[PDB]
Design a protein around this ligand. Sequence first.
Ligand SMILES: Nc1ncc(-c2cnc(C3CCNCC3)s2)cc1OCc1ccncc1
Ligand SMILES: Nc1ncc(-c2cnc(C3CCNCC3)s2)cc1OCc1ccncc1
Lengths: 298, 298
Amino acid sequence: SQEDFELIQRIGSGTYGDVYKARNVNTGELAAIKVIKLEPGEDFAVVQQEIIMMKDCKHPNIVAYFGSYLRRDKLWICMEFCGGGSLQDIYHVTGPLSELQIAYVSRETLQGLYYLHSKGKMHRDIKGANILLTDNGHVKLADFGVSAQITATIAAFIGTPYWMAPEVAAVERKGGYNQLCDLWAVGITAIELAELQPPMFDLHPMRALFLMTKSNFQPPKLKDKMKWSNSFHHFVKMALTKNPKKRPTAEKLLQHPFVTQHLTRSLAIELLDKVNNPSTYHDFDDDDPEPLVAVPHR
Amino acid sequence: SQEDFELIQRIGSGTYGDVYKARNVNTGELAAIKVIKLEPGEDFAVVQQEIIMMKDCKHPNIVAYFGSYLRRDKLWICMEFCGGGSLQDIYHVTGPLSELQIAYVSRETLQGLYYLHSKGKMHRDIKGANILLTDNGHVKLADFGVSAQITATIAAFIGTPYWMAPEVAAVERKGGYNQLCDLWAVGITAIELAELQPPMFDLHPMRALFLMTKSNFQPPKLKDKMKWSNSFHHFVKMALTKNPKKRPTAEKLLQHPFVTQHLTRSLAIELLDKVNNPSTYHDFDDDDPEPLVAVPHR
Ligand SMILES: Nc1ncc(-c2cnc(C3CCNCC3)s2)cc1OCc1ccncc1
Ligand SMILES: Nc1ncc(-c2cnc(C3CCNCC3)s2)cc1OCc1ccncc1
């Protein structure tokens, strides 16, 4: 029941409700609980779908589902607690991530999407706010709300299609995209972790979307042409292929040098320590540990 | 009240409900009545908006509003009766229209849109089914349901815009077009009246809209390159300008030769007679009317 957990503190805000740090009353285990307020009679098929998808995903790079409890218009969704927090929360304190840190995160995210895509699902909201870190440095993906929204909307034109002007047709269209769009978000997220914000972030949301549809649109690059290697640049160049049909899948991009190089969870531990560091030194004593083998000096 | 009219026969189907030929109980005047079934609690702001717009338009090329009556979930909207019927209804019996007939209809439609556009309104569903004819050959535009829908929807992204792939952005966009889209519909309608159906009519609605958004999209032409004049072709070429900013407005297109030439309601009377003709001859007697001036012959 809900009574098995005690909400400790709000740690974020999901697509729907608030996320709270929580503790189990008996086991003492930590967990993250998404509290969602439901209005009577409202379309439940959406939060219902999110739970099902969470319930249907068991992968080391996806936030694991513990349980869900509904009590009087208040729905709790229990999941594993990622101590590090969102990457966005991290690089807001931390500076920009390292290239190797971006590389590690990217490979793990791609591993998560690989799983989702084989299942035939898509995340459709891949960003720094949805990529979490465990205390040991593991990378998990979160927030299946958007995914759930898109699935639920699979169910009416305004006007008649054939008589629509091209600019009206662009707005009257629906669907027509697949899971390869997640790969684009990986490319944008790569930039996001590098430059503390996605490209075009200063524009209005509608204005940014309109620019992407223009025929003369060219995919973003990394501003510092010299700060990052050719692999990182090339990785983003592939991930940010405008044409979806020629865009590399999750497996093809996992075969890329930038993510196929040696990358361990040490890099995330580093990142976590920097967040736990708001100090370049500490007290110490360095002399000869054992007198028995202490080299003499006169 | 509703009791002032008696529904005679269904004459069409609007965006919302059925349209009935109707007669006034007292005056004996004919009228068209749109019967709309409303569910309790439903968004009325849309049919409410349609009435207001109809009520707000007094132009010789727009179907005039007589009244509207609501009685127990059943809303009547009374308007002038166009004896000829829809152009689509006409060319389904009639063959394709003449070039001069298409020209006459086009000028009158443009005159209607000119009025709407000066008021800052848009039709957004200009087609043969919405262009009516009076018994005397006058051309009126109808069906403000779509217009009303678009206005009412002026009031939430799925996912975050900046991380969206271009193909997702295309579907997540909204608005971004103006009344110039009506001019495109005029161009398509010109083809429709000429070839008994719009271009791409054999495609699926979604497929047709997707093709229009492609960068390599080229506006349709008239299939018979030799059946119609250069003016008609050029008229459609202007009206079907892919780029909305360079697309001629309603006034600019009214200055075009194809519609600035001599065109009278005789052409519509012709069209109406052909519909009232499902016969190339009839009984007659041709000899010398008056003997007093009858020229002799021996
Ligand atoms: N499963 C989760 N585990 C931990 C967090 C945390 C978020 N912020 C945290 C702070 C960061 C700063 N240091 C203290 C801890 S931990 C969020 C989680 O999930 C979020 C979520 C969002 C949307 N849908 C589902 C889950
Ligand atoms: N005001 C209207 N006056 C007459 C018709 C007619 C439609 N079909 C007609 C037949 C054609 C064949 N000959 C017999 C008559 S008359 C439709 C009208 O309006 C339609 C409308 C649609 C959608 N929203 C508003 C109005």
